[PDB]
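Case study B.
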Amino acid sequence: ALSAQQLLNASKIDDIDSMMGFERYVPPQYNGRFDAKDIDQIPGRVGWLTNMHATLVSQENQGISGVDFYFLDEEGGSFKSTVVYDPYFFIACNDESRVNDVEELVKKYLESCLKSLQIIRKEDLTMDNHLLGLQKTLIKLSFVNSNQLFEARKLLRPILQDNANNNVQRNIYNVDAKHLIEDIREYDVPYHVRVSIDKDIRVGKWYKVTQQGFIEDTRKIAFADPVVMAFAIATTKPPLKFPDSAVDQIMMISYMIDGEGFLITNREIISEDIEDFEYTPKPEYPGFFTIFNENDEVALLQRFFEHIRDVRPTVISTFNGDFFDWPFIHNRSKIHGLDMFDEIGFAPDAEGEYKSSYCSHMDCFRWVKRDSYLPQGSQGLKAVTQSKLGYNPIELDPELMTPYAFEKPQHLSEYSVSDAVATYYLYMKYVHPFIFSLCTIIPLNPDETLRKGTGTLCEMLLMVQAYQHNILLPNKHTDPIERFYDGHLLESETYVGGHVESLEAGVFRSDLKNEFKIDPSAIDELLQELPEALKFSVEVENKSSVDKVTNFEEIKNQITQKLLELKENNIRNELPLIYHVDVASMYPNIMTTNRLQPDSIKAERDCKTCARKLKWAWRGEFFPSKMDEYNMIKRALQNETFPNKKVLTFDELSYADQVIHIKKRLTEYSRKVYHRVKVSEIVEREAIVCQRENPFYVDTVKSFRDRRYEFKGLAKTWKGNLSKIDPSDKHARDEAKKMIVLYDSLQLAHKVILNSFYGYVMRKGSRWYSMEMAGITCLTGATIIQMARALVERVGRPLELDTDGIWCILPKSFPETYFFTLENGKKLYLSYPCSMLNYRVHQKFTNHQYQELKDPLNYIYETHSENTIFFEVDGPYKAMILPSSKEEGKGIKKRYAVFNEDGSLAELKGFELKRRGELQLIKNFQSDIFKVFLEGDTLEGCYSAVASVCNRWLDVLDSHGLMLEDEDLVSLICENRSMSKTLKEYEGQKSTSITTARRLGDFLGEDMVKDKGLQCKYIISSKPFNAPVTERAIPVAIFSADIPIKRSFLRRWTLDPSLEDLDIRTIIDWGYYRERLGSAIQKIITIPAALQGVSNPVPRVEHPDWLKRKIATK
DNA sequence: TAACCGCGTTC
DNA sequence: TCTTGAACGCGGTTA
Ligand SMILES: Nc1ncnc2c1ncn2[C@H]1C[C@H](O)[C@@H](COP(=O)(O)OP(=O)(O)OP(=O)(O)O)O1
Ligand code: SF4
Ligand SMILES: [Mg+2]
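Model:
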């Protein structure tokens, strides 16, 4: 069957890898001991593992499944070895009495696929008394191949759906072996992952291939060096349109190999014989490119395909090559009669992405999207290169590439080549070390470590831990389709997340005095807690003792001066310090403090201080209908013929689509009757957390957090090295910076995976699901951060607060940073505002019930006090600009701008210029104003220097843009906007992006709006009027097209049949665009100035009504 | 006015 | 088949 067509395919693959140099090496036979202390005398071959692929092999009739491992040896060659391992899953029963009887049933019903049967015990944390050593008995169903495992799984799931569904009734006045199968387990594990876990094999490690298995060579830890190749293509699309594979040609293909770069050209579209040249933006990224000037598109592709075979790459890297680059090559190779699989070994898979067997295809766009921590507006290759590579790649309009093929091709080749050097060094500096080091710990291959969701990565890490501790894997979670509460059907239940608040707004600077009204009782507490808060810092936060200090009383008196000095002067006016307090890896440390894991959340029925009762906050959004109502609409629905995708009944439907209809018909009934559709209620629930459960989950979080803490630490050490270096030595400074951009990206690359251990608990299909633990983690974080704000509020003023961070000001007379001294010829760091917080969270949040198993054989536990929740401080900063809302008594959260002592921009957040695709004028306005919030010498002087830039930008919108040129206009007025889906999935929804897409469709043709993610760049129109903005967006692209279609389309949407004008200035509603500018100046300039006591610096933007009335009263 | 949506941020 | 979470700003429609 498919074993036959699956064993044919391997032949093909087996021959491809041999063509690309991957011999199938079988180790010599060895009748000796499986020694580990010396692997040198055991005969075999050493290799650095570089890929894995599940395959189907034959002896030495149906296939026996296994994994092909691709190696790079130390002699400079390569080989390939295979392991065989029986796929398997388990069966669980109700009655341990009858365990041997159902095994008899399994052997006979699964006769055609079962290979072996076994009775296995595993620890199951679902089970009473499992912490005393009790285990659960399972039946292990091994198989030959994975095609037979699937057959058996399709033979039992019928039984599983009888043992629950019904129960036939016969003799009403009155046990089968089939009803003992409670469930199957570990049935949905992918085969290649099952092998790497059970055999403890990872890509990026060194193994000595031997007859009895792979032996990890603990000696060599450093990676080997593959042969890397990155490439980017250039095409010849039509003007105004994205390239199509059918017609469009292929001008060039640039690529790089192991540090030497190459370029091949198509002379039927080009026009010159480009000569060998150099392009290195920085001396660290060489780019000497030798060009292969070829004639036709076939000579192109045939030289590319032959060069790959001549270099044997183990990794091909691209940039959005799975959605464009590769897929075009295949369609233009088929168009010219070639087989990519037969020539290179690449082909698309079930997900549409391109892969091979010997060569991992690394699409850099997936590391940038997932691990770069860059905003979506910075995920193009240019923004990525400036951010991560430290130079500017050459930009070129897409609508000038194919003309400049004939026009000026020696610059076109520089674009071609710049995209390659960007892609090659981006991969070599960021993608290669991150992904391959991630394969060291995560049991997948490079092209899957690169593409899986971060939640799935966490699932993989937790499975290795569950397997090595002999823990039975829970099945994948399935959400209940119907859930109720007090008689109402619910729309969405959730917990309340973190705590966000904006408190003050405006400008604050390290040289402009501020007013601090201080609570004396607050300092009185700081007075009492002071002796123990310093004993805190030296012990908990530095791992030392006050016995070794030389100056504890010397500094304790030193800082009690500055606090008692303030005890008298409650009201002061001094320069402020701008500081930031944020706890390091909050939610992970909240979890590892409270021993929080999903299996630790028990009930009353799952059970002297082991149970730790913690509180979370449930939030439900339910309909305002009762079940009498709910019952009434189901009867109406039952008398309706529904389509089949000829017409079926309501009960013949799928239950999932039943609720869908019910919800859509309860959608409108509940509204017209019960006045609304969503009613919100939040109840604070309590849950217990066993402090003695198998800590396999929380130990995976602690292990991964510790793995990130080192990178986050090394970055700080190199930050100080950059401080203590002369402001000139080029190499030095550069080197530092280079290292601090790598170690910040790396620690941030671990940041999302680390925090995905908390999100995994709520993920759809999670094996370890529990709404309780995610809610407990958030409310603990909320209560911690609100306790911290209540303290700083009484001694300074916090400006903004989010989840675990607090921006604040404190008077300059407040104690800042001191350093303890030891008799070791060393010193210890202390910043009092951090420690005063950390002492008091270590007094109201430590876990005095943390129990750990300290002798397993006798099942003894021991209690201690664990808490790893520390604040960290960054600063002091020079300035911070916080906007304010256009409504009364309301700031705005999640956006501000801070500035380093240097004047450099430290952090800018939330605003429109960072966001992907807003309107460029607002983006250009914002990238102009925050900089001149640093000029001037008084506050009201600041707001007027910034007002100059505000009025100059208003002059552009007030003068109808007649100062900007007819080409520098269209970009400053553009509004580029992405559409997550395709048009027909938006029917019923009317936005500006919607109509721009439909208008761009019947102009350029339906080929423009085929795939999703399309960029709706448009302008708002003046005509028609007395109408919505929704029905007024004009696709900006028409203005470069042909005049009659210009007038035809524009006249249709303007409702004016006369072609009065064709200029952008004619149709654009300037009153709209100046109102969107007026809102920006209100939020960032004037309203902030008012609340700081400065009259309107830009009186051309008018204060809102409520603030005028508030000004008149004062 | 206020609820509610899509998008893309900040956590 | 594959799949981290919630809170929020802002423009825009809808009730
Ligand atoms: N992608 C995310 N997914 C889930 N939770 C997140 C995410 N980002 C931030 N958070 C949640 C969990 C965080 O611990 C918590 C605080 O975020 P944040 O302070 O920015 O980083 P962090 O506290 O986890 O590490 P650190 O502060 O050292 O950079 O909010
Ligand atoms: S809290 Fe105590 S009684 Fe309850 S399950 Fe855990 S160990 Fe058993
Ligand atoms: Mg934090």
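Residues 895 and 909 of chain A are 5 Å apart (CA to CA). The remaining cases will be described in the next quarterly update.
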